[PDB]
Write an enzyme that holds these catalytic residues in place. Structure first.
Site, mmCIF file in Angstrom:
data_model
loop_
_atom_site.group_PDB
_atom_site.id
_atom_site.type_symbol
_atom_site.label_atom_id
_atom_site.label_comp_id
_atom_site.label_asym_id
_atom_site.label_seq_id
_atom_site.Cartn_x
_atom_site.Cartn_y
_atom_site.Cartn_z
ATOM 1 N N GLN A 13 0.785 -1.225 -0.114
ATOM 2 C CA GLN A 13 0.012 0.073 -0.045
ATOM 3 C C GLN A 13 0.772 1.320 -0.017
ATOM 4 O OE1 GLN A 13 -3.692 1.976 2.319
ATOM 5 N NE2 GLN A 13 -2.889 -0.081 3.042
ATOM 6 N N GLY A 67 3.147 -6.357 5.968
ATOM 7 C CA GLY A 67 3.843 -7.730 5.497
ATOM 8 C C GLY A 67 4.051 -7.954 4.257
ATOM 9 N N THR A 68 3.327 -7.322 3.368
ATOM 10 C CA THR A 68 3.528 -7.393 1.767
ATOM 11 C C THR A 68 4.767 -6.593 1.494
ATOM 12 O OG1 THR A 68 2.714 -7.081 -0.557
ATOM 13 C CG2 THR A 68 1.830 -5.490 1.300
ATOM 14 N N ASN A 81 4.177 12.643 1.008
ATOM 15 C CA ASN A 81 4.438 11.348 0.238
ATOM 16 C C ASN A 81 5.082 11.927 -1.002
ATOM 17 O OD1 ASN A 81 4.456 8.828 -0.835
ATOM 18 N ND2 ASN A 81 2.322 9.137 -1.317
ATOM 19 N N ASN A 136 8.978 8.836 8.846
ATOM 20 C CA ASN A 136 7.871 9.377 8.903
ATOM 21 C C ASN A 136 7.963 10.616 9.598
ATOM 22 O OD1 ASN A 136 6.095 8.010 7.010
ATOM 23 N ND2 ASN A 136 6.147 6.202 8.498
ATOM 24 N N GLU A 194 26.886 6.209 -11.456
ATOM 25 C CA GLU A 194 27.768 7.072 -10.766
ATOM 26 C C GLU A 194 27.434 7.544 -9.158
ATOM 27 O OE1 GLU A 194 28.287 10.712 -13.202
ATOM 28 O OE2 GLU A 194 28.926 9.489 -14.792
HETATM 29 N N1 LIG Z 1 3.971 8.280 0.160
HETATM 30 C C1 LIG Z 1 3.307 7.587 1.148
HETATM 31 N N2 LIG Z 1 3.940 6.337 1.944
HETATM 32 C C2 LIG Z 1 3.045 5.757 2.775
HETATM 33 C C3 LIG Z 1 1.641 5.823 2.478
HETATM 34 N N3 LIG Z 1 0.933 4.944 3.612
HETATM 35 C C4 LIG Z 1 1.812 4.361 4.337
HETATM 36 N N4 LIG Z 1 3.071 4.792 3.954
HETATM 37 C C5 LIG Z 1 4.180 4.163 4.805
HETATM 38 O O1 LIG Z 1 3.559 2.978 4.917
HETATM 39 C C6 LIG Z 1 3.819 2.273 6.163
HETATM 40 C C7 LIG Z 1 2.830 1.088 6.482
HETATM 41 O O2 LIG Z 1 2.047 0.828 5.514
HETATM 42 P P1 LIG Z 1 2.215 -0.619 4.454
HETATM 43 O O3 LIG Z 1 3.694 -0.922 4.589
HETATM 44 O O4 LIG Z 1 2.012 0.258 3.213
HETATM 45 O O5 LIG Z 1 1.342 -1.682 4.860
HETATM 46 P P2 LIG Z 1 0.782 -2.668 3.707
HETATM 47 O O6 LIG Z 1 1.713 -2.646 2.601
HETATM 48 O O7 LIG Z 1 -0.725 -2.673 3.070
HETATM 49 O O8 LIG Z 1 1.056 -4.328 4.262
HETATM 50 P P3 LIG Z 1 -0.385 -5.065 4.569
HETATM 51 O O9 LIG Z 1 -1.244 -4.480 5.314
HETATM 52 O O10 LIG Z 1 0.173 -6.353 5.260
HETATM 53 O O11 LIG Z 1 -1.211 -5.487 3.065
HETATM 54 C C8 LIG Z 1 3.549 3.467 7.163
HETATM 55 O O12 LIG Z 1 4.143 3.439 8.293
HETATM 56 C C9 LIG Z 1 3.799 4.679 6.089
HETATM 57 O O13 LIG Z 1 5.060 5.392 6.836
HETATM 58 C C10 LIG Z 1 1.225 6.694 1.764
HETATM 59 O O14 LIG Z 1 0.025 6.810 1.287
HETATM 60 N N5 LIG Z 1 2.067 7.315 0.949
#
Ligand SMILES: Nc1nc2c(ncn2[C@@H]2O[C@H](COP(=O)(O)OP(=O)(O)OP(=O)(O)O)[C@@H](O)[C@H]2O)c(=O)[nH]1
Ligand SMILES: Nc1nc2c(ncn2[C@@H]2O[C@H](COP(=O)(O)OP(=O)(O)OP(=O)(O)O)[C@@H](O)[C@H]2O)c(=O)[nH]1
Ligand SMILES: Nc1nc2c(ncn2[C@@H]2O[C@H](COP(=O)(O)OP(=O)(O)O)[C@@H](O)[C@H]2O)c(=O)[nH]1
Ligand SMILES: Nc1nc2c(ncn2[C@@H]2O[C@H](COP(=O)(O)OP(=O)(O)O)[C@@H](O)[C@H]2O)c(=O)[nH]1
Lengths: 22, 428, 56, 47, 434, 386, 440
Positions: free
Chosen positions: G11, G144-145, G228, G206, G254
């Site tokens: 995500q 997790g993903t 983001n 973050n 580089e």
């Molecule tokens: N630019 C940007 N970074 C993000 C965003 N959402 C989350 N992050 C980072 O992603 C972290 C955790 O979310 P994810 O790693 O995406 O969770 P996930 O990929 O859905 O993993 P699962 O829930 O198991 O499917 C957060 O701590 C954020 O710092 C976003 O919308 N935009």
């Protein structure tokens, strides 16, 4: 003699490349 | 006076000849309908070499069209200079070669070869002093290889004192358009050795190589690839069609480029070759023609000539130009490159200069190179044939049409038996 | 305001690499090897203004 | 004679059209009939 | 001049023939009436010109049971096919190779051979036959086998291409399909010069993934098969750069006579509202054919050995680009050829882009049909072998055959020669060591 | 007649040589199209030193333009005098050097050196009496270092009696646009010492010293720097265009090892001070010899002038009396010793070298390069104190 | 020609790619239909999209990206919203069950339903690509993903694609805010399983963007979009010299060769300058020295680790806009003379300067219009603090084994935790001999 010892290709040389689809 | 009967066999040979005739018709002055409209007098002095006379002051090619499938006859007829050939010379069969040397040498090709020899005799006896025959074909595939070699054998048996030049397209290492190209090439080379006088091996990889880097064309097509070979053919047969200084016909080329009889597998070349966007940055003169001509990226066979010594070299220049400059340049290239020329053949470059250039130019050059480097082609095809005859796959067609297992071994041993002299001369 | 689309600085079509021809419109039977990138006009202007630092 | 002229005219026109189609490098390497694709999308949605 | 005769056998053969002949009619211009509105020669390979501008197809539709021919004789193409071409019996073959080959085949073989003989008499140069059937039903197994047995003795020198629907490795539709398939692959091994086989589950996957059809049907499957066969027999319909004949199709696939089972794949199977986003360039359409998901059987060529390949390009395509795509293919280690066929590619190019029936496939000016002979087909053979062994271990459904008239040992002998065909496949695919 | 083959390695060398061809074309009277449009007949008298003839009176530079990245040579063509070079002289690589010496000397660079030697031979054959080659390169980074020194090695092997003028852009004391420039410079000075005949060390810090403290520019640019470099080049080579290379090398290289030179060019005046200038020979000498117009950042007052030249000027266009300095002094010790400490500091902890050892090099190459670069030093400390 | 392939995992990666491809579309001229306006394309010759966008027929400009997620609805905003016609729907790859913040479910059990299809699509993307500059893997060290499927992608891409470069743009877990509780487990597992496969891994925290958006942007209620898009600008600046042309261009090779001293250390700190907020941006002139001071100020760092608790090794400065090269030479002179910025005792020329002429583009949003900017990547030893904090977190979790039954039931064995912790401890030890001054 230089003016004809030089070789300047004309359009009759570039018009023979790319003439068929095969 | 001298004459060369043009014979074209197979798809590649027919479309290459469908071009050779367009280029030389624009060189002499014949329109698509057949009569002459040109600009100068000396175009008709030696027009009875490739053209037979007809009524109304028109001229027809002295060409024999051979194929075992009626599909490229229609393309030749519907082409630009299609309504110029003799319709009696359009000899063809309603069958299929199927890319088989067997079905071109021991089956329906051997049935149509009598009707082909009929018009071959007709056009070779409507003469007074013939010089020879010029067959255009491809070693890879059927018809052009099988029927071409059977035609070569019969014509060489009948008329032995006349020359037999064969402009042949050989399979290339890079890309192959037929999976039985090694079989066809290996069975055709054995007949090409002890029959013909001047073979010209041409690689489609090398032709596309020239078209991509030398010509810098965006879309190199088959018409263009045949047109380079046509330019080489017209450059080779020039001193017997237009006047010049130190004229060299095809027999003098044969006697000065074939040292020992079996070693006659030449590498053709053509070098006023410039791209349109780089036309104004070039300085086409005598050194530039020889320079691009001995440049080892313009060779139309993919046999790299710095991996082998040149035995003999022929340069047929076109356009009127400085004889002393040509002689000095040919001395200069031999002095500069001493490791690529054999020591037991001194001054091994022959020079012809014809006064009349090809159209679109003022000066031009055509290269004929008999070198040790031709061994790469035969070693490569031998490797392919041993790899694909080791399991004797792709072979039930030949055993069904009537070949024997001993004949393939004979052809392979004969290709190696030509690989032997070409390395003995390279290693003195 | 938000933005002006400046066309002065971007890498134009490569005249020397990727020479398959499927990057310039129309029928072009020769490779484009005359230097005239589609950013020449909007850059030769800046060049005109550039000055040489010997006796200006 | 006239039928042969008609046939040769057909081959000449087809050759010229294919010249203008395959000597166009961009449309030859990647291209399609976008109008036909739009009509096909509309037909698919209607069905 | 370059005619070929189509023989469609069974329900699958008849419906594939419907798709094929509507594609052919839209290709050339022949109306369902049988009359070209425009008013060439390309209508010789499939059509015959009878007087007052009438074009009759060179096909024989055979089924031992009605209503699958009566749908054709009632529908839009009823005036196209000559009514003596479409031949029916009176009893359904009932998923029985015995019924299709031994008792209800003899009431129709004489009439079918008479019609085929009349068609071959109305031909100058016959390129070959195209027999469309399946390895399922009793008609498409037994009557096809008996047809090949008669054609082999009467027309021995002519060429034969089988286009057969091999059973699915998983799903299928019948309980007797393994028996019929084992019985028919052994009788059509020695009587088919080249046999292309397509699998319903693989065309299902292709339709569901590339064509975005979540509910594909037999109309879509047979239209894909129609496009494949039209791409095969195209160089002997229209003109091109490298025109390749039917004898060249037979040549550049088989290294050995018993290995004549290539796999056909098609390129641009794209679905109109996906073609806006990809180039469909010649390299892409060559890669999509070698991808082990566009295959028309459910076998993985990665677990195998590519013997030979023929590429059949239609449309605005240049041999420069064909050679470039071949060179791009010959560097990947996933597509691993055998060591005795280094030059393993044959090319063919025709100038005619595929026509579009109003339907699923998208209008493209580039296509290639891939005919690839490889060792990966042994898996598809051996899975039906496993099914046949499971059922024949305790002799299920065998009483129907042996009461219909065919001997008991046919099952065991067909299984034995199928195992021999396997052993030939691995013996050819294994590398050279001496 | 005598002629010079101009080869240029790298992004830095490509831009320097592009500005060099601009100033030489302005000096002789060649438009960006290529046609001669001049006013004096003496400009075409000895034009065949940098320009080969073509059809229709088109003069094309005798230049080979190399870069392992296929994007700099497009910019060279897009430059002002870009439509003057041969298109086949633009030999290139479809990769990136990536500021790596091994990635120009033992890899892709060594795969492309064959084509570059082909093109250089292709130009050298169509000539009469070649006096020397002229390579412009950056001593730091890739291409100019690795591919450039491999080029120098092969050209020295093939043509043995032709003077190699290599204008090398050495790393600066104050500034460093890369990080592996001590590695590249220390690995390339070794090949510069026993191969080249005349090395010209040109430093960007000294160039900005000139362009700011003497030229009084406010926003000096890279084109400004390369213009100063190119004016120095033209002043060096003007003797055979209007003391030639052989005479300058013989009279100015006493011992065969030490030949690294301080360049300079000094009819130099700011726009604010041009109208009060009184250009004469003593003024040109004072503007020359003073250590503010040095083009390499090592102070000549710290060392002893071994040998000094003065090419006084047909003057360059737009000027009255010009003066080019080329000098061998013991101050060049500072340039090598300032980067020897950088190299031994970055090598003592054995960092930054995995991307040199992964390409096909060994550990001992750096140590032997440092050893012979230090052995370069004792001939430039002994003559500074007799 | 100089293409790079983007893969957006999880995500986090998908919405990162949403922001990034919005900026790429708005900068490179391509509309959210794919078609470029005729005026924008200069005679049909503006090849400065070929590193991100690929031309097909009908003028469409399909991106060279794969948006992969194990679970739905997140790809679905992308394929339903305003950019639904830009991406090919086969580029967007979606499963049906989440990893549920399990590295085990992201790497071992639900990874095999999509790993073959994602690798096939990456093969397809690399097929119409003559020179592949690298892969850009955008993901998080959280979910997790974003841990497990990222690690499996690194394994497969390193086996298939060993000669191509890989840059990670990863979201490191924060010291204080957090989003889950198995976050230290996921981070520690995926750092070990991507350490030997990542060529260079930039990490972004973050709370640092929290502080930057609250301080330099004057906006007290931003969201993940405003957080983001800064990552979008950083990637737009790192691959900028191979999009536009400048005085000193610089390549992905580089960046590595001037940022990575030893093979293990490939974790730089990304910082961006002018993050000013429109009604804060007309009041200062923002010279090159000012924008370099903004990057080297220990408050605009984008990982919550303070650089004065460490020493810089190599800094790659990338300037964009109207930047004078010897003005930036004069600026880096002053940066080197400043004493709070301390370098290691073995890299005295610790700077790489890259200049791109193209000014930064402004999307409709929060950032200001400025004609000068810089992205500064510092490889420093201060990130050992951010490592050791999560080391403490993992120690506190693994002392008595919370949430470990989820990780062991979904395919993964027990000793994976032990070997990941041992490799992390070895890396932390490696930082000590890297940081300590030379005494020999
Ligand atoms: N630019 C940007 N970074 C993000 C965003 N959402 C989350 N992050 C980072 O992603 C972290 C955790 O979310 P994810 O790693 O995406 O969770 P996930 O990929 O859905 O993993 P699962 O829930 O198991 O499917 C957060 O701590 C954020 O710092 C976003 O919308 N935009
Ligand atoms: N494309 C296509 N495939 C079909 C069709 N009908 C059947 N098949 C396939 O062919 C297999 C067996 O069908 P057939 O052999 O044609 O059945 P049949 O010829 O009617 O045999 P009988 O029922 O005994 O008369 C099935 O497993 C299907 O997968 C069809 O109409 N179109
Ligand atoms: N130069 C040239 N080569 C051709 C042409 N047409 C075909 N070829 C080559 O000829 C080879 C096959 O021709 P071939 O099988 O001998 O035709 P066949 O004699 O009728 O069987 C291919 O590999 C092509 O590369 C042409 O028009 N010009
Ligand atoms: N005089 C001059 N120096 C330049 C120019 N371009 C680059 N440089 C110098 O070259 C150095 C880095 O270039 P480099 O990495 O070696 O380019 P490469 O050879 O292609 O790898 C910088 O420190 C610049 O000072 C130029 O146009 N003129």
């Amino acid at each position: 003699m230089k003016e004809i010892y030089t070789n300047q290709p004309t359009e009759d040389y570039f018009t023979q490349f790319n003439t068929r689809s095969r | 006076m001298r004459e060369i009967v043009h014979l074209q066999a197979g798809q590649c040979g027919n479309q290459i000849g469908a071009k050779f005739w367009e280029v030389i018709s624009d060189e002499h002055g014949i329109d698509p309908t057949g009569t002459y409209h040109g600009d100068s007098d000396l175009q008709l002095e030696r027009i009875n070499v490739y053209y037979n006379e007809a009524t109304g002051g028109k001229y027809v090619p002295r060409a024999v069209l051979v194929d075992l499938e009626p599909g490229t006859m229609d393309s030749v007829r519907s082409g630009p200079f299609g309504q110029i050939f003799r319709p009696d010379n359009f000899v063809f069969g309603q069958s299929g070669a199927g890319n088989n040397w067997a079905k071109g040498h021991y089956t329906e090709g051997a049935e149509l070869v009598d009707s082909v020899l009929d018009v071959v005799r007709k056009e070779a006896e409507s003469c007074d002093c013939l010089q020879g025959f010029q067959l255009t074909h491809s070693l890879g595939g059927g018809t052009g290889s099988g029927m071409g070699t059977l035609l070569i054998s019969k014509i060489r048996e009948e008329y032995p004192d006349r020359i037999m030049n064969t402009f042949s397209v050989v399979p290339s290492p890079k890309v192959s358009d037929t999976v039985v190209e090694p079989y066809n090439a290996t069975l055709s080379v054995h007949q090409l050795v002890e029959n013909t006088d001047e073979t010209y091996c041409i690689d489609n990889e090398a032709l596309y190589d020239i078209c991509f880097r030398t010509l810098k064309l965006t879309t190199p097509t088959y018409g263009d690839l045949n047109h380079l070979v046509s330019a080489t053919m017209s450059g080779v047969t020039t001193c017997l069609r237009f006047p010049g200084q130190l004229n060299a016909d095809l027999r003098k080329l044969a006697v000065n480029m074939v040292p020992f009889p079996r070693l006659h597998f030449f590498m053709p070349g053509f070098a006023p070759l410039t791209s349109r966007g780089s036309q104004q940055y070039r300085a086409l003169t005598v050194p530039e023609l020889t320079q691009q001509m001995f440049d080892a990226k313009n060779m139309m066979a993919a046999c790299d000539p710095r991996h082998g010594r040149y035995l003999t070299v022929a340069a047929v220049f076109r356009g009127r130009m400085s004889m002393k400059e040509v002689d000095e340049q040919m001395l200069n290239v031999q002095n500069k490159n001493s490791s690529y020329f054999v020591e037991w053949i001194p001054n091994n470059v022959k020079t012809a200069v014809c006064d009349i250039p090809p159209r679109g130019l003022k000066m031009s050059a055509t290269f004929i190179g008999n070198s040790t480097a031709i061994q790469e082609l035969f070693k490569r095809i031998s490797e392919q044939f041993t790899a694909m005859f080791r399991r004797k796959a792709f072979l039930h067609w030949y055993t069904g049409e009537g070949m024997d297992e001993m004949e393939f071994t004979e052809a392979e041993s004969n290709m190696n038996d030509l690989g032997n002299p070409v390395v003995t001369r390279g290693a003195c | 305001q938000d933005d002006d689309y400046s066309v002065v600085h971007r890498k134009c079509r490569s005249q020397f690499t990727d020479l398959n021809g499927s990057k310039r419109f129309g029928i072009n039977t020769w490779h484009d090897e005359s230097g005239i990138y589609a950013n020449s006009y909007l850059k030769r202007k800046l060049y005109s203004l550039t000055t040489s630092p010997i006796a200006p | 004679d006239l039928e042969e002229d008609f046939g040769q005219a057909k081959k000449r026109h087809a050759e010229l059209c294919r010249q203008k189609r395959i000597f166009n490098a961009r449309n030859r390497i990647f291209g399609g009939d976008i109008d036909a694709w739009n009509v096909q999308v509309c037909d698919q949605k209607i069905r | 001049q370059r005619e070929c005769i189509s023989v469609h056998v069974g329900q699958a053969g008849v419906q594939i023939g419907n798709a094929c002949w509507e594609l052919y009619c839209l290709e050339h211009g022949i109306q369902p009436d049988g009359q070209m509105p425009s008013d060439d020669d390309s209508f010789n390979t499939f059509f015959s010109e009878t007087g007052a501008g009438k074009h009759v197809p060179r096909a024989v539709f055979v089924d031992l049971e009605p209503t699958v021919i009566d749908e054709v004789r009632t529908g839009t193409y009823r005036q196209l096919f000559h009514p003596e071409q479409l031949i029916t019996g009176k009893e359904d073959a009932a998923n029985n190779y015995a019924r299709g080959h031994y008792t209800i085949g003899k009431e129709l073989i004489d009439l079918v051979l008479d019609r085929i003989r009349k068609l071959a008499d109305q031909c100058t140069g016959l390129q070959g036959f195209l027999i469309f059937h399946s390895f399922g039903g009793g008609t498409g197994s037994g009557f096809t086998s008996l047809l090949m047995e008669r054609l082999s003795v009467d027309y021995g020198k002519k060429s034969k291409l089988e286009f057969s629907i091999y059973p699915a490795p998983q799903v299928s539709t019948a309980v007797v399909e393994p028996y019929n398939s084992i019985l028919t692959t052994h009788t059509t091994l020695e009587h088919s010069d080249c046999a292309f086989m397509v699998d319903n589950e693989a065309i299902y996957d292709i339709c569901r993934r590339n064509l975005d059809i979540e509910r594909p049907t037999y109309t879509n499957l047979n239209r894909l098969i129609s496009q494949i066969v039209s791409s095969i027999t195209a160089s002997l319909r229209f003109d091109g750069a490298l025109n390749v004949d039917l004898t060249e199709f037979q040549t550049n696939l088989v290294p050995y006579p018993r290995i004549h089972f290539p796999l056909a794949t098609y390129a641009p199977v794209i679905s109109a509202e996906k073609a806006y986003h990809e180039q469909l360039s010649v390299a892409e359409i060559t890669n999509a054919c070698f991808e082990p998901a566009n295959q028309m059987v459910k076998c993985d060529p990665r677990h195998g050995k590519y013997m030979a390949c023929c590429l059949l390009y239609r449309g605005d395509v240049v041999p420069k680009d064909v050679n470039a795509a071949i060179a791009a293919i010959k560097t990947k280690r996933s597509i691993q050829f055998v060591d005795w066929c280094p030059t393993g590619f044959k090319v063919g190019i025709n100038y005619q882009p595929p026509t579009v029936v109003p339907g699923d496939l998208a209008k493209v000016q580039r296509a290639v049909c891939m005919l690839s002979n490889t060792t990966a087909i042994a898996e598809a053979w051996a899975r039906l072998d496993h099914k046949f062994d499971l059922m024949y271990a305790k002799r299920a459904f065998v009483h129907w055959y042996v009461g219909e008239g065919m001997e008991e040992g046919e099952f065991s002998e067909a299984r034995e020669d199928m195992a021999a065909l396997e052993k030939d496949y691995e013996e050819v695919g294994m590398d050279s060591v001496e």
